[PDB]
UniProtKB/Swiss-Prot annotation:
This is Intimin. Transmembrane segments: none annotated. 'Inverse' autotransporters have an N-terminal translocation domain followed by the passenger domain, as opposed to 'classical' autotransporters which have N-terminal passenger and C-terminal translocation domains. Has a signal sequence, a periplasmic Lys M domain, an inverse autotransporter domain (residues 210-411) predicted to form an outer membrane-embedded 12-stranded beta-barrel, followed by a linker domain (residues 412-449) also embedded in the outer membrane, and an extracellular passenger domain (residues 450-934) with a tightly-folded proteinase K (PK)-resistant, non-Big domain (residues 450-550), 3 Big domains and a C-type lectin domain. Residues 195-204 are annotated as: Signature sequence for beta-barrel assembly machinery (BAM), which recognizes the unfolded beta-barrel in the periplasm. It is found in: Cell outer membrane. It comes from Escherichia coli O157:H7. Changing residue 233 to A: Disrupted salt-bridge between the beta-barrel and the linker, but no effect since acts as the wild-type intimin construct consisting of residues 1-530. Changing residue 29 to A: Disrupted salt-bridge between the beta-barrel and the linker, but no effect since acts as the wild-type intimin construct consisting of residues 1-530. An inverse autotransporter. Adhesin, which mediates attachment to the human intestine epithelial cells. Necessary for the production of attaching and effacing lesions on infected human tissue culture cells. Anchored to the outer membrane by binding to peptidoglycan (PGN) via its periplasmic domain, thus helping in receptor interactions during host invasion. PGN-binding may also aid in resisting mechanical and chemical stress during transit of the bacterium through the gastrointestinal tract of the host. Residues 230-242 are annotated as: Minimum linker residues necessary for formation of a heat-modifiable beta-barrel.
Length: 242
């Protein structure tokens, strides 16, 4: 009957501690094409942010191409951002690229006394792969890049010019319902951080028992099982300061 995904994320490790809930909700669903909306919110790094997007995914037997557009709103700091994303996915392999475009201007900072803040423009490229012979095991590679004289990519107490970072992570999905992982990130100025995270994933089209059985993890990681996965993007609005 119903199709799509609800996902809770819990994360900790430093600056971006908190929780989130997101939904992927199809409005047109055929073998060749899916059109969907995605909506969610999060309380992370002492800010409340909500996000609304839509896109399409186009399917071939061996691959999927997709695009999406997002509006990101940090209600705590009143910062607004436009997002655009592309997708190229296959069995056991999900690649995405995302662009992050400021829609609001300088204004008095929410967290930093004596500063103005606004969204930092940037992009990221994201890969998630799963071992085909043991798909419960996944790896994550991200490159991200942001622009401005004083950007807070790692935290807002160490501001940096045009910072970039590479993330490498591993994660484990014993059953489709839950994924746990650890992400290591290294960036400019020799910044490093660690992110521990757990996701609870509910698939609307799956029975309860299917979602707590290890044998359905492989299905989830194939192209056709992954079709309702959330967009891979950063839903947090990275800020710059002046
Ligand atoms: C702020 C300016 C940026 C623009 C924001 C607009 C965001 C919308 C983005 C993507 C929406 C595209 C999805 C809409 C595409 C729907 C296609 C469809 O359902 O066709 C089915 C028929 O073929 C059945 O016969
Ligand atoms: C579905 C799409 C997946 C395909 C991935 C796309 C491949 C992208 C290839 C190369 C991206 C390299 C970006 C280039 C790296 C940018 C570095 C920069 O902007 O300057 C930093 C200085 O200004 C600091 O002061
Ligand atoms: C710390 C534990 C966090 C809670 C774990 C929750 C796991 C799922 C995560 C988000 C789910 C929220 C939305 C859950 C929505 C479920 C709707 C439902 O029950 O299906 C109707 C069908 O039975 C009709 O046939
Ligand atoms: C090979 C695979 C390796 C993976 C194995 C690594 C194990 C780490 C697992 C889970 C960490 C869970 C962290 C949960 C985060 C705590 C909740 C939180 O910090 O946020 C609450 C916040 O107050 C709300 O707004
Ligand atoms: C609509 C806005 C929804 C969520 C904003 C914050 C979402 C946090 C939802 C997580 C629910 C959860 O899993 O709570 C576990 C723990 O208590 C957490 O600290
Ligand atoms: C600036 C222009 C971009 C537009 C941005 C708006 C976001 C959604 C847009 C259009 C929905 C168009 C119609 C498609 C919506 C449902 C499609 C449909 O007709 O479904 C048929 C039915 O499901 C058969 O089983
Ligand atoms: C403006 C933003 C987007 C334009 C929306 C583009 C709508 C393009 C239609 C997609 C489509 O018709 O896909 C058919 C599918 O291949 C058969 O099920
Ligand atoms: C900047 C972009 C703003 C985003 C705005 C984009 C427009 C669509 C977005 C969300 C719709 C929410 C999803 C709609 C849920 C409808 C469910 C439905 O139609 O059920 C029929 C079935 O899903 C058919 O298979
Ligand atoms: C920029 C707009 C001004 C600000 C607006 C703030 C409020 C909008 C929040 C969320 C919209 C998306 C919610 C869509 C939820 C629809 C899900 C649904 O009803 O479809 C499932 C149903 O079971 C199928 O038959
Ligand atoms: C740009 C600002 C956007 C702000 C947006 C307001 C805050 C929305 C926050 C969280 C989710 C919103 C609730 C949407 C719930 C839809 C889920 C749904 O329709 O469920 C389908 C059903 O469960 C099938 O089994
Ligand atoms: C139909 C199949 C669709 C598949 C194809 C979808 C194509 C669009 C996808 C992603 C957009 C990525 C946007 C990346 C923009 C880079 C932003 C940037 O580089 O800003 C730096 C600026 O110059 C400061 O100096
Ligand atoms: C559809 C597939 C799309 C894939 C594309 C994703 C990767 C490229 C993204 C951004 C590159 C932008 C290049 C910007 C790097 C240099 C900007 C710069 O030099 O900064 C301004 C200057 O320093 C002032 O003095
Ligand atoms: C536990 C420490 C790390 C362990 C976890 C590391 C998992 C491996 C990650 C990426 C390699 C696998 C990526 C999969 C690449 C296959 C590309 C593909 O599309 O394969 C088609 C499929 O084999 C037929 O349909
Ligand atoms: Cl990701």
């Amino acid at each position: 009957q119903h199709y799509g995904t609800a996902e809770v994320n819990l994360q900790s490790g430093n600056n971006f501690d908190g929780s989130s809930l997101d939904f992927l909700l199809p409005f047109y669903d055929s073998e060749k094409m899916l059109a969907f909306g995605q909506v969610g919110a999060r309380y992370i790094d002492s800010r409340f942010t909500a996000n609304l997007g839509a896109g399409q995914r186009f399917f071939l037997p061996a691959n999927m191409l997709g695009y999406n557009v997002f509006i990101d709103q940090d209600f705590s700091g009143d910062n607004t951002r436009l997002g655009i994303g592309g997708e190229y996915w296959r069995d056991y392999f999900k690649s995405s690229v995302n662009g992050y475009f400021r829609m609001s201007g300088w204004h008095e900072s929410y967290n930093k006394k004596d500063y103005d803040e606004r969204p930092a423009n940037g992009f990221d490229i994201r890969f998630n792969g799963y071992l085909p012979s043991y798909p419960a095991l996944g790896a994550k590679l991200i490159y991200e890049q942001y622009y401005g004289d004083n950007v807070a990519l790692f935290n807002s107490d160490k501001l940096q010019s045009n910072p970039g970072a590479a993330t490498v992570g591993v994660n484990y999905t014993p059953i489709p319902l839950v994924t746990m992982g650890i992400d290591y990130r290294h960036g400019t100025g020799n910044e490093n951080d660690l992110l521990y995270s757990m996701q609870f994933r509910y698939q609307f089209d799956k029975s309860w028992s299917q979602q707590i059985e290890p044998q359905y993890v492989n299905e989830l990681r194939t192209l056709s099982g992954s079709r309702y996965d959330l967009v891979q993007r950063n839903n947090n609005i990275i800020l710059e300061y002046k």
